[PDB]
Curated annotation (Swiss-Prot), chain B:
Gene name as annotated: TS1
Pathway(s): Amino-acid biosynthesis; L-threonine biosynthesis; L-threonine from L-aspartate: step 5/5
NCBIfam families: thrC
Residues that coordinate or bind pyridoxal 5'-phosphate: 276-280, 397
Source organism: Arabidopsis thaliana
Regulation: Allosterically activated by S-adenosyl-L-methionine (SAM). Activated by S-adenosyl-L-ethionine, 5'-amino-5'-deoxyadenosine, sinefungin and 5'-deoxy-5-methylthioadenosine. Inhibited by AMP.
Essential cofactor(s): pyridoxal 5'-phosphate
EC number per UniProt: 4.2.3.1
Name of the protein: Threonine synthase 1, chloroplastic
InterPro entries xref list: Cys_Synth/Cystath_Beta-Synth, Ser/Thr_deHydtase_PyrdxlP-BS, Thr_synthase-like, TrpB-like_PALP, TrpB-like_PALP_sf
Amino acid sequence: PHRTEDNIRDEVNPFSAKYVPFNAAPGSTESYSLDEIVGLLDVEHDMEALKRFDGAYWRDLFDSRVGKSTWPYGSGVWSKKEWVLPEIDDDDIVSAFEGNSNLFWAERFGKQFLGMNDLWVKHCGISHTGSFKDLGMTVLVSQVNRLRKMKRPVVGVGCASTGDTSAALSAYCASAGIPSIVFLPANKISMAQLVQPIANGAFVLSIDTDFDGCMKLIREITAELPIYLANSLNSLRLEGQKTAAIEILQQFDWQVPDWVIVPGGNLGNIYAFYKGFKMCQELGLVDRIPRMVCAQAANANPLYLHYKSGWKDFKPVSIDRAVYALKKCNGIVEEATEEELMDAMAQADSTGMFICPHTGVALTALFKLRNQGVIAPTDRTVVVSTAHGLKFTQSKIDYHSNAIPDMACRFSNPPVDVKADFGAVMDVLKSYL
Amino acid sequence: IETAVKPPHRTEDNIRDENAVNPFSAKYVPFNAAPGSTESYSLDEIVYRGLLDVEHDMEALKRFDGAYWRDLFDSRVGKSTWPYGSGVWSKKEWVLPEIDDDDIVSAFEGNSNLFWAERFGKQFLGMNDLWVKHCGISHTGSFKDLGMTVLVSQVNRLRKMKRPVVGVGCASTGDTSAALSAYCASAGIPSIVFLPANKISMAQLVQPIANGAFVLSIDTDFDGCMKLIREITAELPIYLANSLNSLRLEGQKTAAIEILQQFDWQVPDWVIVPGGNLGNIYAFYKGFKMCQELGLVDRIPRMVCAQAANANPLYLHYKSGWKDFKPVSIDRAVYALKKCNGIVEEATEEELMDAMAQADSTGMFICPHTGVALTALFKLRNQGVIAPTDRTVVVSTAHGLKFTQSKIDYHSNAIPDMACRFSNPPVDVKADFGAVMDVLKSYLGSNTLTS
């Protein structure tokens, strides 16, 4: 007769968190009940309250929740609730038990292509929406669900993008029965790109105008209707995303890896991991944080240049957080060309994986840093995969059919045509074998 | 009191640290018979006297009580050690007891997400304890990975014992082939796909291709193809994917053990298994059964085999009380369903799709088979067979991401001979505040009279 929510409702909160200006002096502070958006905001937890419990207490508390199907600890994010949204009521949490993603030992690729024996991939993309964003959306949508119930007018959530952010947002909104709206220029509508929000019941508007005319319409609409924008409560999603780092540690029985390579499409990622590794060390779960590499596609943004110039010319798509993080962990930034990224992807896939392009960027960077002697053959290294390879089948098909203009596709493995003659078949097989 | 761990060591070397007599073993046995024949797993038998089944020495296993097994397995949860980091190998003693960890080929498959379908359960079925076992949320996006790690590990073992095995072959284009080639690539074992040229589809073969499989586009049909395969394998040491079929079930059954483990060893009332491949339902039965026989739990759940309408004679036989059943091979499914007081139900193409759209509307992103499973669940709910509070688990065998075209077609009302009654296409609107505000107002249902 009872659901898991009842089961746990059967059992003062010392923990809390608040918005704070990202990296400031004694500054100000906002509440999560508010919709502040700005200087970027950062979520700050009461470290004083948390330090009242030692490292062993936190390691054990979290480990005791591993493998459970209870509410809401069955989630890799909520199993660390005290460090994410300490004050939310379990009744408001919107979760699909995201997290607890596969931590894969890349034995063959590590050894055959990098002379490594301890290379791993954190498959954040192996989840229900096929994206790392689910970790952040469970937090954002839960908070929105909380505010909604406190009768703080919130008729729905809005979004103006067509990628993974939108897919994860609409999936969680649908889960809580919260209206989800997607605002897009008609010429940007692609059934393929919108398959998830669409399947998830989102209200997708094909507006006859351009991006600018669209942003203008959104601003006007949200100005008169209680509709929060996806990338508005951006700071909140990092609280969910940072648990992936805590998870890596937990999965290694609380041993800190030497290197963690994070593909930086969204530069908030690297900061989220840093935030997660950092909270673990500050609270004594572990004694150190790993050095991190921000792997970027060539010419994606000025981050790589600044890194090469020792950060000297850096002045606070917003690389502030990434710079801060990399500085704090003696980090590094490396690039990968379109062709390196794709060839690395084909090489990884040839060893049995089925990765996303970003992971190709991460592995290219790993290759380079290996040659440069920065990363040792025996360094325990973790590459973060943020999206399921299945989302990039067209790209793989193009590469393997040598259909990518201005690229050799040197590792393509197209089907081999052969006549239905025992002799002919035996000959091609003989060569292959 | 032990030597410090070496930095050049991998988790595989790290566990080689072990030496007495292994009390556990398994062998091929004729499926469902009386006292008799047997063959080793190192052998390549396929039929007997016809299906083979893997039998474990229950005598040896029963020497350890239920609590010992529950605790041994639970102690491996959340670990990244070799090979226990795998949801399959964490139950090694019950899968391939004699294989050496050095021969195991694994990508730490298993430990898949067990999701509480709160909203769908309550809103569409009046249920409070409905769950989905996401076997499809894995590296190849398929449930087959649980079986291929076992099959490819065994093949890898036989290969190293110098028992000639130059590679593995396959004549299909679906998930089986994707999982097979991924694991083969992982062990550096040649993988070959034999297909008629007219059946080659880059989209259907993206994984074996990306995984380095040797894909042959043969100018002939299916029959000419099977003939060629029969000939090739007769002169070359190449095992066929669906040849060592029995072995795959050993891996697949761990999904059932995992469901129990995830519910803190509490047996669900119902488990609904979409039966495209009829071996699935038997694998789950095998898993639940072994847990009860060894005392981990004291009962098995009742099961439902959810089939697409007219997929095979299983549904009919079930309706005729199995009376007319005479031993693509439904023998295993029948046996299992009989053993657990099981049920068979159907779903039409449209019911399956509508159910899929309804499930997705609550936040999921399921495969068509899950639609079949939910349609069956709906029916059994109406019939009163399944109670509103029954702890029920629906098994999803493939990631919804593998069926985006299908969803796109349905939501764009482009599926011939179907209403697509729950399609949710994008809504066209003019760039006018008033216009936009009007559609949103309607959507948000902010009217008090037509609320």
